[PDB]
């Protein structure tokens, strides 16, 4: 079964950028719910229940027809949020090979940011915006609801290994920003954990 | 060109069920944006720019491939919210032919409410829950994002003439209910305008 991961910081550790109230609800209510629903669905599937969540979502097609959607939405939710919590932290700086790769594939850090913001802001409805590694090139993509690039293009409309991502579901920013998603996206740059992003980029898997 | 419709009541007229703050943001920010976005896309489409929004959404397949999605999302948003504002009012009572039809197709009003709540709560991500009329029979269905039964089954996955509907996008209930969508759905019963629902049921078109 999956365990709800604890956060690597206090609920107010991202202030004054991301509000403490949202961090707590987002983690203890929303993420908890996705974990519960995924675990409940996997109860009768011992074989799949043993796999790490990141691996399970790459095999949604091998699941019984009646368990595919619930796991896509909830296991996808668990995987995305787990990655999200670890990808946030104040005081980090983009540098090293990751910075070099971004300037290489996007021309500059500013161009990359503009592209990411465009994808995050244009996602209509609920979804996520991502910086992914496809083979050896970095790219920006967005997915609907709780889909992940790890699920494959056939299912999510995108592919690649997630380096970092931003939750653009309204519950992630409504309490503090209401309809102003663009403001939320801007504040994100102040809390994106570049150290974790660099680590994932190095691993590539 | 489309314009934001004025409300037939004040922003605090649905208290203590729907909060004044949300009513104001929902109308002046969200709905206004759908209207603005739809108008911007229609500027270069003289042939569709002057159709009533309810007519435009039944003809999405006739639109240029590059305009279809933007209008589906924004004209769909304009149509759904316009219907939503008119469908809310305190102090109404379910009765007459509408009540008889509900008891007929659902067994009882309580069974109907249970079915509606289930559909509204089960819609994952952003969407709408509807009570529609099809083949002289009432049915409950839900759609994703800003799709509408009026768009047809091929596009929205549902069909029928909408009698009433409930917005379950998180912006519709997050400020007051946060993650508790079920509580929001229950409060809805206190503000659903049965008089307007009865009128639409009588018209059937
Ligand atoms: Mn989320
Ligand atoms: Mn809405």
End-to-end CA distance of chain B: 23
CB distance B179–A73 less than 8 Å? no
Which of B89, B112, B133 terminates a domain? The answer is B89
Candidates A118, A126, A154; CA nearest to B146 is A126
CATH number of the domain that residue B179 is part of? 3.55.40.20
B27 assigned binding-site residue:
no
CB distance A178–B33 less than 8 Å? no
Number of H helices, E strands in chain B: 11, 3
- Smallest Cβ distance to A171: which of B30, B73, B179? B179
Candidates B13, B1, B29; CA nearest to B169 is B29
| Co-location of A55 and A112 in the same domain | no
* Any domain includes B132: yes
List chain B residues with CB under 8 Å of A175: 174-175, 178
Which region holds residue A181: left if phi is over 0, alpha if psi is between -120 and 50, else beta? alpha
B26 assigned binding-site residue:
yes
Rounded distance from Cα A63 to ligand 1 centre (Å): 24
- Domain holding A189, by residue range, is 90-205
CB A146 within 8 A of CB A80: yes
| Co-location of A66 and A106 in the same domain | no
- Taking CA atoms, A11 is separated from A17, A49, A53, A89, in Å, by 12, 30, 24, 12
Nearest-Cα distance to chain B for A49, in Å, is 23
Structure tokens at A75: 């296991």
In chain B, residues 59-78 whose CB comes closer than 8 Å to chain A: 73
| Co-location of A66 and A105 in the same domain | no
* Any domain includes B1: no
Which of A89, A124, A144 terminates a domain? The answer is A89
| Co-location of B39 and B128 in the same domain | no
| Co-location of B78 and B94 in the same domain | no
| Co-location of B49 and B114 in the same domain | no
Nearest-Cα distance to chain B for A175, in Å, is 6
As a whole number of Å, the CA-based R_g of chain A is: 17
Q: Look at the block and give the residue holding tokens 């592919």.
A: A159
Structure tokens at B204: 């059937």
E strands present in chain A: 127-134, 137-144, 161-167
Sequence-ordered alpha helix ranges (H) in chain B: 20-25, 32-42, 46-49, 53-56, 68-86, 96-106, 109-122, 153-156, 174-177, 181-188, 194-203
| Co-location of B113 and B149 in the same domain | yes
CATH number of the domain that residue A42 is part of? 1.10.287.990
* Any domain includes B7: no
| Co-location of B95 and B63 in the same domain | no
Q: By what technique were these coordinates determined?
A: X-ray
Other C-beta atoms closer than 10 Å to the C-beta of A70 total: 16
Tell me which long-range contacts A11-20 makes (C-beta under 8 A, separation of at least 24).
A13/A89, A13/A90, A14/A88, A14/A90, A14/A191, A17/A90, A17/A187, A17/A188, A17/A190, A17/A191, A18/A88, A18/A176, A18/A187, A18/A191, A19/A175, A19/A176
List chain B residues with CB under 8 Å of A178: 25, 29, 171, 175
Sequence-ordered alpha helix ranges (H) in A28-95: 32-42, 46-49, 53-56, 68-86
| Co-location of B120 and B179 in the same domain | yes
| Co-location of B97 and B190 in the same domain | yes
CB distance A174–B179 less than 8 Å? no
Other C-beta atoms closer than 10 Å to the C-beta of A4 total: 16
* Any domain includes A3: no
* Any domain includes B116: yes
Hey, of B38, B147, B174, B181, which one would you mutate to test binding to chain A, going by the most A CBs within 10 A of its CB? Answer: B174
CB A87 within 8 A of CB A162: no
Nearest-Cα distance to chain A for B176, in Å, is 9
| Co-location of A94 and A176 in the same domain | yes
Task: Tell me, yes or no, if B92 comes closer than 8 A to chain A by beta carbon.
Answer: no
Which of A63, A89, A115 terminates a domain? The answer is A89
CB B170 within 8 A of CB B64: no
Cited resolution, angstroms: 2.0
Candidates B56, B48, B62; CA nearest to B79 is B56
As a whole number of Å, the CA-based R_g of chain B is: 17
* Any domain includes B165: yes
Q: How many domains would you assign to chain B?
A: 2
What is the C-alpha separation between A15 and A116, in angstroms, rounded?
Answer: 22
What is the C-alpha separation between A116 and B129, in angstroms, rounded?
Answer: 32
* Any domain includes A176: yes
Peptide bond into A151 cis (omega under 30): no
Q: After which residues is chain A broken (C to N over 2.5 A)?
A: none
**Between vectors from CA A166 to CA A9 and to CA B18, what angle results, nearest 5°?**
90
* Any domain includes B8: no
- Taking CA atoms, B28 is separated from A200, B3, B31, B111, in Å, by 42, 11, 6, 35
A·B CB contacts under 8 A:
51
| Co-location of A99 and A200 in the same domain | yes
């Amino acid at each position: 079964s999956y365990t709800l991961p604890s956060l690597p910081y206090a609920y107010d550790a991202l202030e004054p950028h991301f509000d403490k109230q949202t961090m707590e609800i987002h983690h203890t209510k929303h993420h908890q719910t996705y974990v519960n629903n995924a675990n409940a669905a996997l109860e009768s599937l011992p074989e799949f229940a043993n796999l790490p969540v990141e691996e399970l979502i790459t095999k949604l097609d091998q699941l019984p027809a009646d368990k595919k959607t619930v796991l896509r939405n909830n296991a996808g939710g668990h995987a995305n949020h787990s990655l999200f919590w670890k990808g946030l932290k104040k005081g980090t700086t983009l540098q090293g090979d990751l910075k070099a790769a971004i300037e290489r594939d996007f021309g500059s850090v500013d161009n990359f940011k503009a592209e990411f913001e465009k994808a995050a802001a244009s996602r209509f409805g609920s979804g996520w915006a991502w910086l992914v590694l496809k083979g050896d090139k970095l790219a920006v993509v967005s997915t609907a609801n709780h889909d992940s690039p790890l699920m494959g293009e056939a299912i999510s409309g995108a592919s690649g290994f997630p380096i970092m991502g931003l939750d653009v579901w309204e519950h992630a920013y409504y309490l503090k920003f209401q309809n102003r998603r663009p403001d939320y996206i801007k504040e994100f740059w102040n809390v994106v954990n570049w150290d974790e992003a660099a680590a994932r980029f190095a691993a590539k898997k």
